[PDB]
Design an enzyme around this catalytic site. Structure first.
Site, PDB file in Angstrom:
ATOM      1  N   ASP A  73       0.846  -1.164   0.000  1.00  0.00           N
ATOM      2  CA  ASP A  73       0.000   0.000   0.000  1.00  0.00           C
ATOM      3  C   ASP A  73       0.897   1.234   0.000  1.00  0.00           C
ATOM      4  O   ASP A  73       0.704   2.175  -0.778  1.00  0.00           O
ATOM      5  CB  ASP A  73      -0.895   0.028   1.239  1.00  0.00           C
ATOM      6  CG  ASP A  73      -1.813  -1.193   1.351  1.00  0.00           C
ATOM      7  OD1 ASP A  73      -2.111  -1.835   0.323  1.00  0.00           O
ATOM      8  OD2 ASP A  73      -2.203  -1.531   2.492  1.00  0.00           O
ATOM      9  N   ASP A  89       2.015  -2.210   4.737  1.00  0.00           N
ATOM     10  CA  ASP A  89       0.756  -2.808   4.298  1.00  0.00           C
ATOM     11  C   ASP A  89      -0.259  -2.819   5.432  1.00  0.00           C
ATOM     12  O   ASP A  89       0.072  -3.190   6.558  1.00  0.00           O
ATOM     13  CB  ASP A  89       1.003  -4.234   3.879  1.00  0.00           C
ATOM     14  CG  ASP A  89       0.428  -4.543   2.554  1.00  0.00           C
ATOM     15  OD1 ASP A  89       0.282  -3.617   1.757  1.00  0.00           O
ATOM     16  OD2 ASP A  89       0.156  -5.722   2.292  1.00  0.00           O
ATOM     17  N   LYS A  91      -3.677  -4.271   7.100  1.00  0.00           N
ATOM     18  CA  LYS A  91      -4.528  -5.459   7.114  1.00  0.00           C
ATOM     19  C   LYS A  91      -5.516  -5.351   8.265  1.00  0.00           C
ATOM     20  O   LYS A  91      -5.285  -4.638   9.241  1.00  0.00           O
ATOM     21  CB  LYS A  91      -3.683  -6.729   7.132  1.00  0.00           C
ATOM     22  CG  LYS A  91      -2.384  -6.556   6.304  1.00  0.00           C
ATOM     23  CD  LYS A  91      -2.092  -7.594   5.202  1.00  0.00           C
ATOM     24  CE  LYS A  91      -2.629  -7.165   3.805  1.00  0.00           C
ATOM     25  NZ  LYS A  91      -3.001  -5.659   3.628  1.00  0.00           N
TER      26      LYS A  91
END
Lengths: 244, 244
Positions: A73, A89, A91
């Site tokens: 990301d 990232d 999540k």
DNA sequence: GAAGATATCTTC
DNA sequence: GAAGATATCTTC
């Protein structure tokens, strides 16, 4: 550091704001859903400005994927350090009851960790860190009030599809487990533990290299893994017995 | 009809509103990303309150899944008619240009269409209609203002991650194609066409039953399908040869 | 066109 | 645990 700054920024932001809907430029408000398909997206968008603020103030360039489905990301790097990128990232996972065990899927184990240029913004070897911003929310049943649009000054009248959102930043390798996170979608599974073990980094791999190797040689199906290895103990013995 | 009123109401909302971000109860705004994992979720929520309104005006109870990966997004039904339920699903796709061909993934071909009660809010035989609310947007890139957070008196500054969103309503069987829309996750593929053909209903199947039979007998891989059927034409020849 | 990627969860 | 579902996309 960038990291400790990021987590304090994250907790802070999370403590002060509760996302309640999508606003249209004309001012109309659509409430949210209490499923992860919705909340992971919401939480991803909630993080974006935080990561960039903190990143920016530390002299790091923030780059998002331009193409879709490319990890990560967020790609962070000091211009003077092109080969010292940090991948971030986001999540999300849920909890049925507040304070129960969680688990995350940690991305593919057959993509970029196996192919230096596959599904990634910059070749994998260019990253020195792979951080995970994990959000955990407790599910909240949808009420009839969700099926309505709202006005700007009715924000608190808008019902939230979660309770108890807790966030953490941790190294991907430190929170990795030895069990698949997904089947057909071949994801690395994280450790199955409570929120605090993710904060405190209660991993099971000895180093980032062990993490990467276990996952690079993990077979896609149990039939193939049962004749090689299926958990960290069998991997080590497989390494020992000469790899095989 | 519920349907013409739904389609019109959809058209009009999309015409009067541009979603530009997520809002927190405290009024802070995080703008939207440019991929479909964001916009699908965004168009999905946008649609929720419109569908509800039209269904209630028409005396239909609206039901979303309690459960997470249970089709459909919305189960509409007249109390008086429990076995004449209508399934409504929101799906999104994009175009690099403004008026190019598009295709949608129309859901699994191995779940509820193969097992009356698998991944579905109500047994599949209680649905007499399966609608698709399709959204198409042209992808736009930016960041010259997307990584900041806005306040409510700033909705105007926010950059919208898309251009030319169009929406249509159509019976799934009427826009279903004969080529998979995904491999490992086995989704039904729609026809590969222009926005106009979806609105139109330029499908290829004779009836919802042919749609269902094609998809219930479709083999998961081409190896398996080259010895059976791989398109509507070959399928028909397969029906003809005596389903063999 | 086919297969497998993006992320996360439920079913078996 | 494993496998396959949820949705959509890119890669091959």
């Amino acid at each position: 550091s960038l990291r400790s700054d990021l987590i304090n920024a994250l907790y802070d932001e999370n403590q002060k704001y509760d996302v309640c809907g999508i606003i249209s430029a004309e001012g109309k408000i659509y409430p949210l859903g209490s499923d992860t398909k919705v909340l992971s997206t919401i939480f991803e968008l909630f993080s974006r400005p935080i990561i960039n603020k903190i990143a920016e103030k530390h002299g790091y360039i923030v780059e998002e994927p331009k193409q879709q489905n490319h990890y990560p990301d967020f790609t962070l790097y000091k211009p003077s350090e092109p080969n010292k990128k940090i991948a971030i990232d986001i999540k999300t996972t849920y909890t049925n009851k507040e304070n129960e065990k969680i688990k995350f899927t940690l991305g593919g184990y057959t993509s970029f960790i196996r192919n230096n240029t596959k599904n990634i913004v910059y070749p994998f070897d260019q990253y020195i860190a792979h951080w995970i911003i994990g959000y955990v929310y407790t599910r909240v049943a949808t009420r009839k009030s969700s099926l309505k649009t709202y006005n700007i000054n009715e924000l608190n009248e808008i019902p939230k599809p979660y309770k108890g959102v807790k966030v953490f930043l941790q190294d991907k390798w430190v929170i990795a487990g030895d069990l698949a996170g997904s089947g057909n979608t071949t994801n690395i599974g994280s450790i199955h533990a409570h929120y605090k073990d993710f904060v405190e980094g209660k991993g099971i791999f000895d180093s980032e290299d062990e993490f990467l190797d276990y996952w690079r040689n993990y077979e896609r199906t149990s039939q193939l893994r049962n004749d090689k290895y299926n958990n960290i103990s069998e991997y080590r013995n497989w390494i020992y017995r000469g790899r095989k």
